[PDB]
Design an enzyme around this catalytic site. Sequence first.
Site, mmCIF file in Angstrom:
data_model
loop_
_atom_site.group_PDB
_atom_site.id
_atom_site.type_symbol
_atom_site.label_atom_id
_atom_site.label_comp_id
_atom_site.label_asym_id
_atom_site.label_seq_id
_atom_site.Cartn_x
_atom_site.Cartn_y
_atom_site.Cartn_z
ATOM 1 N N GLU A 7 -19.823 29.540 -141.957
ATOM 2 C CA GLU A 7 -19.215 29.299 -143.251
ATOM 3 C C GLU A 7 -19.500 27.858 -143.672
ATOM 4 O OE1 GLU A 7 -14.995 29.981 -143.103
ATOM 5 O OE2 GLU A 7 -14.687 29.527 -145.226
ATOM 6 N N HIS A 39 -24.287 15.585 -137.583
ATOM 7 C CA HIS A 39 -24.580 15.850 -136.183
ATOM 8 C C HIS A 39 -23.369 15.475 -135.355
ATOM 9 C CE1 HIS A 39 -24.973 11.665 -134.793
ATOM 10 N NE2 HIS A 39 -25.607 11.412 -135.924
ATOM 11 N N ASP A 74 -14.608 22.999 -134.951
ATOM 12 C CA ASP A 74 -15.295 22.622 -133.706
ATOM 13 C C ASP A 74 -14.503 23.101 -132.481
ATOM 14 O OD1 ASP A 74 -16.678 21.324 -131.545
ATOM 15 O OD2 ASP A 74 -17.142 19.574 -132.760
ATOM 16 N N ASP A 76 -8.552 20.243 -128.323
ATOM 17 C CA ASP A 76 -8.894 19.028 -129.076
ATOM 18 C C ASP A 76 -8.573 19.135 -130.568
ATOM 19 O OD1 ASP A 76 -9.727 16.408 -129.589
ATOM 20 O OD2 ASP A 76 -11.851 16.771 -129.283
ATOM 21 N N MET A 121 -18.708 24.540 -145.488
ATOM 22 C CA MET A 121 -17.487 23.819 -145.799
ATOM 23 C C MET A 121 -17.891 22.544 -146.539
ATOM 24 S SD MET A 121 -15.145 25.789 -144.471
ATOM 25 C CE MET A 121 -13.672 24.821 -144.151
ATOM 26 N N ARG A 134 -11.322 15.150 -136.837
ATOM 27 C CA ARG A 134 -12.788 15.189 -136.683
ATOM 28 C C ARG A 134 -13.285 16.628 -136.452
ATOM 29 N NH1 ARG A 134 -10.991 12.596 -132.176
ATOM 30 N NH2 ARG A 134 -10.467 14.024 -130.467
ATOM 31 N N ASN A 135 -12.386 17.513 -136.024
ATOM 32 C CA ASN A 135 -12.747 18.893 -135.688
ATOM 33 C C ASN A 135 -12.353 19.912 -136.752
ATOM 34 O OD1 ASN A 135 -13.955 18.127 -133.229
ATOM 35 N ND2 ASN A 135 -11.996 18.292 -132.123
#
Length: 304
Positions: free
Chosen positions: A102, A29, A175, A154, A104, A158-159
């Site tokens: 997709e 999440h 993201d 960004d 991952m 993390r993305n």
Amino acid sequence: YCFAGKTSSISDLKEVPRKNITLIRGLGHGAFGEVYEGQVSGMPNDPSPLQVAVKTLPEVCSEQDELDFLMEALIISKFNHQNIVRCIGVSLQSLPRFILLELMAGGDLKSFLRETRPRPSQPSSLAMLDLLHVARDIACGCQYLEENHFIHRDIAARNCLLTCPGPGRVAKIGDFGMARDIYRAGYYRKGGCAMLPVKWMPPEAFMEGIFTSKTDTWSFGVLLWEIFSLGYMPYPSKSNQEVLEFVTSGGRMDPPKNCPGPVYRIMTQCWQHQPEDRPNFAIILERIEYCTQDPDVINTALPI
């Protein structure tokens, strides 16, 4: 929503029937909603269903959240590059709403780097070339965004996501929430000062609110540091404000532990104070490629 000289709306998204979608397991999440592993198939039983990630919208949400969710789907769906996660379609006509992406299986890049750090029980889980390949992957994605005049805003570990944990893994930008917020509202709309990724931002971004493709260049530098530190928080001993003051006065991070000089040089070039002095992504890719060509770079041991 417009991209690369084309405008599209909700209706250009492939709506896949809700009955065709099965949720397998929770994956994670972010700030708002969940991501699950799923399967799609219009056939019972189907020997080989299409495996997917399913991003959800909380049913308790504003009309602005719903539109945000819509815009995320449109944005992803309009990209066409191997280093950006694909949108398989959507399930918007049922609740909760789904975006199909997709799968991952490698998970996010930050988590991967932390969990796959070499350490006695896993002495050679990862090598220098693995890190250079991840860097090149994301740089390719960033170049595609650049050539298509899209500012991510960004670019951080993390993305990013990985297709698998093992050899052959491909890193991709996943993201696009930040760009989505700016596209819809013109500013970080559900955020605020404390939530801004200041550790990934160049001076002109956090000082003047000026964003260009050279913004992503700076951020990619910080991502390089993240990759080659094997998943440490940027500016590890520093708070956001200390970083602001540090960076604006010309301060930069030291090399990560064991980082080859040619790789560190790329970071510092990405961190040039004036955006015009920073390399574009074609140059970054060229310099990354040159690093991979140097046996002394690729034969460097990662710290255990």
